[PDB]
Structure 1
Amino acid sequence: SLAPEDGSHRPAAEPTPPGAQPTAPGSLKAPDTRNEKLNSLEDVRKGSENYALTTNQGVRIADDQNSLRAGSRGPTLLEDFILREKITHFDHERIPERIVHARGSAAHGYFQPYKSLSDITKADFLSDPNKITPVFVRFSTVQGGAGSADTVRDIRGFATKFYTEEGIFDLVGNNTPIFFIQDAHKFPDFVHAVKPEPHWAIPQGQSAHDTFWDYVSLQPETLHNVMWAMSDRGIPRSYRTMEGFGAHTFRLINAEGKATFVRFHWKPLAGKASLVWDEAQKLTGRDPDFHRRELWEAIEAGDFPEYELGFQLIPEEDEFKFDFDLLDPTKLIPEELVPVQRVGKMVLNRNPDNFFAENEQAAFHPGHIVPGLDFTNDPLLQGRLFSYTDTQISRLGGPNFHEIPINRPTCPYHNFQRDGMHRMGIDTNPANYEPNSINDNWPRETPPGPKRGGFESYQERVEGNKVRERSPSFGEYYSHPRLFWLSQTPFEQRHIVDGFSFELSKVVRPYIRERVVDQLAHIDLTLAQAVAKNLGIELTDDQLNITPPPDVNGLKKDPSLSLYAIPDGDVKGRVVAILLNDEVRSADLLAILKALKAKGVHAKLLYSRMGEVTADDGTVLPIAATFAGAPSLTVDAVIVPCGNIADIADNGDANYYLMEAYKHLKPIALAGDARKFKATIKIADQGEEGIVEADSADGSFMDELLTLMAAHRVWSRIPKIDKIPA
């Protein structure tokens, strides 16, 4: 009986904000949050309270502290089957990690369409606005291992398993609308180039090394997704604040057999928001689990991640109406040309119970479609269809990975497939082949139809010779990079410049830097000059003369490509550091905390040690963490309430907190005497945009702060930060 008698070992089963309670398995945290998939997992959920400790064969263990030996200092005996079972299971706990997207964080939720999409697709899950479809989503990085850091610069995966009434549909996308290469045959070359180098296995979680930029310099098709990765897109604030995309053109097929080309989108209802590089990189050290943690705690708090599914739709007759090929996954479809039509909403509202069992074993694969969808000849998508089935044979130990509970369909599955390693299903069918008469030919094929029909591929015409040949329509590499560049704000552009400069600076062979610079000179000369200056490289007159690539279908920009050009701020679920002192002005804290609560913004109360401090009026303030324990990297803004500022004015950590927050462009608010900190960050007496200051935290102080928070960062501060030593 080792639990504390006060029951404080057990987190409350009610929504609680980040840091308030220990985190728990989703079914213990939020037992009343249900969906059909979560319910269907009950057959395999294993409890523990009130149960005897046993071997796996059900035998009660008396002494789980000792091996069986001859004498209490004697040798361990081979007949200790209890020891050997327990050590054997431990010795085999690991399975191979995913070849790519090894690092991922996942949650349960549901999806519902806004209205029936029957006119354009017979997919059952999109047929009725009252049809709720359970989902399991895993977000990920790409390059690093399962034990690598979350806030690296990388593409992010966004994979959604829809447990539909007519089968599993996996929408396996990323946080940018394109991919680096055109044809799946090159995927191991590209991935090998970005992954740690094979002699020494360095670097982890980074493209900032020779082989990646070598490959990019020799394969200009890469440049478009490289632009995305070098922008602040490569370092999202949270999985809740990035976009998702299927990348490829797929098809919707309706009941009448009409095909429409579609590209899939996820819009984050919490808005788009990213870190800045120095912050992101430092955060991989102070909290390598920041995104995993932030996702988990948002869900425990009730700030459920929500996304709107949208479709770019293109009629068949319009296949050839763009300057780029629809089947080229290095090309995006600009929303100015083809708008995203809202389809439905996905809400992630429960964490898993066991990460290994639900997250690590989950298998997503874009070939898992359902009637009412179909593929295209996109030669990247075509090769993906082969890989995601093949890879599970080692990763999940054989062909029965669909019987792993997280992977099971919630709808019926019956066929003539048998055996394989780990077979769970016990088939009673007299027949394991068809056609058969001995079971009256059951289970039976189903003709295609408007609903509940069998899958039939769209009868697309194929005409050509058998060739290993790239379509000439795919041979244009620069105009999409340029459209992306021209769509970014000036501060975004500067961050792109710095991302290339920083990465190429880690490339040891200078000629590779030079070749990358030359490629940039084919995209935009301003970009290329700015990166060249940072690398001490001088463009040639030839380079200064390269003619830019054409506009994309007459577009000189599209603001939907920018994180920030069109305001979409949402403060709910964000967090503020509050820097306490040993005699806080309690009226300030009351005003601050209640203002934050009313807008769904969380607070963490920080000090120079753990335990408690006491306010002017005697209110006892619980300390969440120390200045060093919970650095400004982990919050969206910082508030210093008034009180005995002398307590902390000389504290190096307290000062550095504000300097780090300041450098990374975060809103800072200072009440009463906290304004003496103005000198630490070099603010003028009359103050500046992005620093909130007043005699107290009453009146408009909290509104001014929340306004800054809704705009995310203080971009206007950028020219100020270069000279500050932080």
Structure 2
Amino acid sequence: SLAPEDGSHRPAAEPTPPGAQPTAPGSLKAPDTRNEKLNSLEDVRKGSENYALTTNQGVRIADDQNSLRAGSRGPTLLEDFILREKITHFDHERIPERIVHARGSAAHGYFQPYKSLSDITKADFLSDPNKITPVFVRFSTVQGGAGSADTVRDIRGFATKFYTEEGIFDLVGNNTPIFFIQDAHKFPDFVHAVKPEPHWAIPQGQSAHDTFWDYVSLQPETLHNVMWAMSDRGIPRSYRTMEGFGIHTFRLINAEGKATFVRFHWKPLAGKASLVWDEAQKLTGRDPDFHRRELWEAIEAGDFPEYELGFQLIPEEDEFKFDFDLLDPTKLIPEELVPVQRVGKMVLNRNPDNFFAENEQAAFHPGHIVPGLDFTNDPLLQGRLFSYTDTQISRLGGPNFHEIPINRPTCPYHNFQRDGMHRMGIDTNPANYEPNSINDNWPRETPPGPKRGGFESYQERVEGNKVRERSPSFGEYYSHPRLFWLSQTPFEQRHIVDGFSFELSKVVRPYIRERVVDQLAHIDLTLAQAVAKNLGIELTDDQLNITPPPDVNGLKKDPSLSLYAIPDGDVKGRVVAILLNDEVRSADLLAILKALKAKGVHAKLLYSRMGEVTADDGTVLPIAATFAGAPSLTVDAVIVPCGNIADIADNGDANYYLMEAYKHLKPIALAGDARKFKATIKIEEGIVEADSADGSFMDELLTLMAAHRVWSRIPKIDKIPA
């Protein structure tokens, strides 16, 4: 036996905070967490304990350390079938990554509606509040490879697979309410422009390069989503603290055949929160797996990601009642005009067992709808319908990808389709065609109806000539970027300006920067002038006289477009770094940890080395990580208790820890002699201080944490050397 006698190799099969135990496969960590889909995967789960090591043919292996050779120093023999099977499997492990959204993190969960929506849709999963639908959700970046970093500046994907009683419904959305382009025909152009440049395959996970900004400068339809990407929306704190959107206008179909236009929303119940750019970029280096880690550990801790599904509903007769086209995916529907109606709740409560088998092989596709839903003529959605089925043929090696366990429906599926690579199902039907008499025509067609009926498309009126032509109604590119801009707080506006300025500073060809500044002048002159100033560009008199674009249906702002204008902070699941010293004041630590526990905030005890330190009262404190090992980038706030401050006062890493946290607008709390640290960080805003840590001290810190970041600190942070 190679396991330690104390059993410290095995994580506790109960909820534990981040860092407390090694992470584990979901069905070992949380064995009692179940749903219909998780149970249906039991047929393919493979254990390991007490089993013999074998070949894939079931032959027991005696020596898994050596190849078969002619003498102990001899050549390896071709008859070593064990070696060749092992190496062959290894040699063929990889499959193509997703063309886009290759970097992603996933979890299992469930969805339940608040009330029946039978009045507006016949979709079974929305028919009854007691109807629970298992889900599998994958969050992702867009540009980067599967080996790229999490905290890049990019759009994020938010894909949900609903295992309904009437079929798989995939809600394949993003974290912004619009897309960059209007027509699917341009998707390869846009994606090629943002992806690493063809000659040298640089840069990874970054849109800050010539080809991206060249395309943007030449395609003003891109400007709306570019605004969102340049904002702090492009750098979420966690997948738990971002919004989700279906983007396209879809249809709901009820039993009477009435169509209602709908746009889908996911509201994070943990609130909206993003990083700041320097923090995000440095985090790609210190922890490229930050979001994947945070998601996994939140679930292991019982801090389940929760989202509320919401619908913006528009009657069919209101199709033309807006200043923009409902079918234009570069346009958002302001919540001030059409509110989001709460529909139900989704809870992600279990991680996968095997990342490759469940996450990598998962196939989501927006064409996977169910009776009660339908499409629209949105020309981006229209092209997506082709792409997802297509790509899955090579990525997942054939037309039987629905037979890969994670992708399998939980409801019945029977048809006349046969064969294909890796065919799992053995069909016993004497017939492989219909109509047939030899099997009494089974499986049979089902007419459409109120429940358990066949799929029938909504009989939308089609009138026109066969044209490859963009609707003139789509030819407005600046009003939604302006609405977005004006809805942001002054600090959010600054971060947008900084995002554009940083990105355009990496564009080698100056004329491209100039062309982008010209586009910005069509959105807002304050924005354009601020970016131009940072690039050493002067706006022309013509540029200064560009008439701003029209309001959107009389709106000059919509606060729902800001991350922070309306506070929605929640501290549960956040993490605090506690900077230890070799003689901690135990009274401070007791008070700190008790207050954090009460609010479900986690703590990580940090020091200059690993192991343990002893407090003033003899309490042995185990160290989670070093100051360098778990930088401030990975936490939400920093607390420094009193004690032997002289031990860490001259520690460069401890001082820098606070300077970085300060720069990145994080709350900092200093008790007793820890207040000596104020001077070393050049000092202000959001610094909690007192003689000791108590109720008052901790309440103040937790109030700051609910506000996420100390925005009031921004005016002089430029001057701080960190």
TM > 0.5: yes
Give the structure 2 partner of residue 247 of structure 1. 247
> What whole-Å deviation, never above 9, does each CA across 1:325-346 have from its counterpart, x for those lacking one?
0000000000000000000000
Distance apart, 1:520 and its partner CA: 0.1
> What whole-Å deviation, never above 9, does each CA across 1:370-403 have from its counterpart, x for those lacking one?
0000000000000000000000100000000000
- Is the contact made by 2:591 and 2:695 (CA closer than 8 Å) also made in structure 1? no
> What whole-Å deviation, never above 9, does each CA across 1:154-203 have from its counterpart, x for those lacking one?
00000000000000000000000000000000000000000000000000
Give the match's secondary structure for 1:700: helix
- Is the contact made by 2:150 and 2:288 (CA closer than 8 Å) also made in structure 1? yes
Distance apart, 1:698 and its partner CA: 1.3
Distance apart, 1:699 and its partner CA: 3.3
Hey, what's the Cα distance between the residues in 2 that align with 1:78 and 1:710? 65
> What whole-Å deviation, never above 9, does each CA across 1:276-316 have from its counterpart, x for those lacking one?
00000000000000000000000000000000000000000
Give the match's secondary structure for 1:503: helix
Give ranges in structure 1 of 5+ residues lacking alignment: none
Distance apart, 1:528 and its partner CA: 0.1
Give the match's secondary structure for 2:513: helix
Give the structure 2 partner of residue 467 of structure 1. 467
Hey, what's the Cα distance between the residues in 1 that align with 2:163 and 2:568? 31
- Is the contact made by 2:577 and 2:635 (CA closer than 8 Å) also made in structure 1? yes
Q: Which runs of 4+ in 1 moved over 3 A?
A: none
Distance apart, 1:43 and its partner CA: 0.3
> What whole-Å deviation, never above 9, does each CA across 1:527-572 have from its counterpart, x for those lacking one?
0000000000000111000000000000000000000000000000
> What whole-Å deviation, never above 9, does each CA across 1:207-254 have from its counterpart, x for those lacking one?
000000000000000000000000000000000000000000000000
Hey, what's the Cα distance between the residues in 2 that align with 1:212 and 1:673? 51
| Correspondences of 1:268-417 after superposition (within 5 Å) | 268-417=268-417
Hey, what's the Cα distance between the residues in 2 that align with 1:307 and 1:709? 21
Give the structure 2 partner of residue 712 of structure 1. 708
Give the match's secondary structure for 1:278: helix
- Is the contact made by 2:195 and 2:207 (CA closer than 8 Å) also made in structure 1? yes
Distance apart, 1:493 and its partner CA: 0.1
Give the structure 1 partner of residue 556 of structure 2. 556
> What whole-Å deviation, never above 9, does each CA across 1:425-474 have from its counterpart, x for those lacking one?
00000000000000000000000000000000000000000000000000
Distance apart, 1:713 and its partner CA: 0.2
Give the match's secondary structure for 1:335: coil
Give the match's secondary structure for 1:568: coil
Hey, what's the Cα distance between the residues in 2 that align with 1:641 and 1:540? 56
Hey, what's the Cα distance between the residues in 2 that align with 1:527 and 1:636? 30
Distance apart, 1:682 and its partner CA: 2.4
- Is the contact made by 2:298 and 2:304 (CA closer than 8 Å) also made in structure 1? yes
Distance apart, 1:34 and its partner CA: 0.2
Distance apart, 1:689 and its partner CA: 3.0
Give the match's secondary structure for 2:481: helix
- Is the contact made by 2:167 and 2:370 (CA closer than 8 Å) also made in structure 1? yes
Distance apart, 1:680 and its partner CA: 1.1
> What whole-Å deviation, never above 9, does each CA across 1:653-700 have from its counterpart, x for those lacking one?
0000000000000000000000000101122xxxx3300000000130
Give the structure 2 partner of residue 597 of structure 1. 597
Give the structure 2 partner of residue 644 of structure 1. 644
Q: Report sequence identity in percent.
A: 100
Give the match's secondary structure for 1:497: helix
Give the match's secondary structure for 1:28: helix
Give the match's secondary structure for 2:466: coil
| Correspondences of 1:103-502 after superposition (within 5 Å) | 103-502=103-502
Hey, what's the Cα distance between the residues in 1 that align with 2:300 and 2:107? 11
Hey, what's the Cα distance between the residues in 2 that align with 1:451 and 1:87? 52
> What whole-Å deviation, never above 9, does each CA across 1:625-659 have from its counterpart, x for those lacking one?
00000000000000000000000000000000000
Hey, what's the Cα distance between the residues in 1 that align with 2:68 and 2:210? 55
Hey, what's the Cα distance between the residues in 2 that align with 1:7 and 1:581? 30
Hey, what's the Cα distance between the residues in 1 that align with 2:444 and 2:595? 62
* TM-score relative to the length of structure 2: 1.00
- Is the contact made by 2:108 and 2:352 (CA closer than 8 Å) also made in structure 1? yes
> What whole-Å deviation, never above 9, does each CA across 1:55-90 have from its counterpart, x for those lacking one?
000000000000000000000000000000000000
Hey, what's the Cα distance between the residues in 2 that align with 1:359 and 1:699? 44
- Is the contact made by 2:270 and 2:306 (CA closer than 8 Å) also made in structure 1? yes
Hey, what's the Cα distance between the residues in 2 that align with 1:196 and 1:404? 31
> What whole-Å deviation, never above 9, does each CA across 1:483-538 have from its counterpart, x for those lacking one?
00000000000000000000000000000000000000000000000000000000
Distance apart, 1:720 and its partner CA: 1.8
Hey, what's the Cα distance between the residues in 2 that align with 1:699 and 1:550? 52
Hey, what's the Cα distance between the residues in 2 that align with 1:71 and 1:364? 53
- Is the contact made by 2:312 and 2:341 (CA closer than 8 Å) also made in structure 1? yes
Give the match's secondary structure for 2:698: helix
Give the root-mean-square deviation of aligned CA atoms: 0.3
Give the match's secondary structure for 2:414: coil
Hey, what's the Cα distance between the residues in 2 that align with 1:680 and 1:598? 32
Hey, what's the Cα distance between the residues in 1 that align with 2:43 and 2:377? 41
Give the structure 1 partner of residue 511 of structure 2. 511
Hey, what's the Cα distance between the residues in 2 that align with 1:123 and 1:11? 41
Give ranges in structure 2 of 5+ residues lacking alignment: none
Give the match's secondary structure for 2:617: coil
> What whole-Å deviation, never above 9, does each CA across 1:256-275 have from its counterpart, x for those lacking one?
00000000000000000000
Hey, what's the Cα distance between the residues in 2 that align with 1:554 and 1:369? 35
Hey, what's the Cα distance between the residues in 2 that align with 1:466 and 1:398? 33
Hey, what's the Cα distance between the residues in 2 that align with 1:576 and 1:680? 21
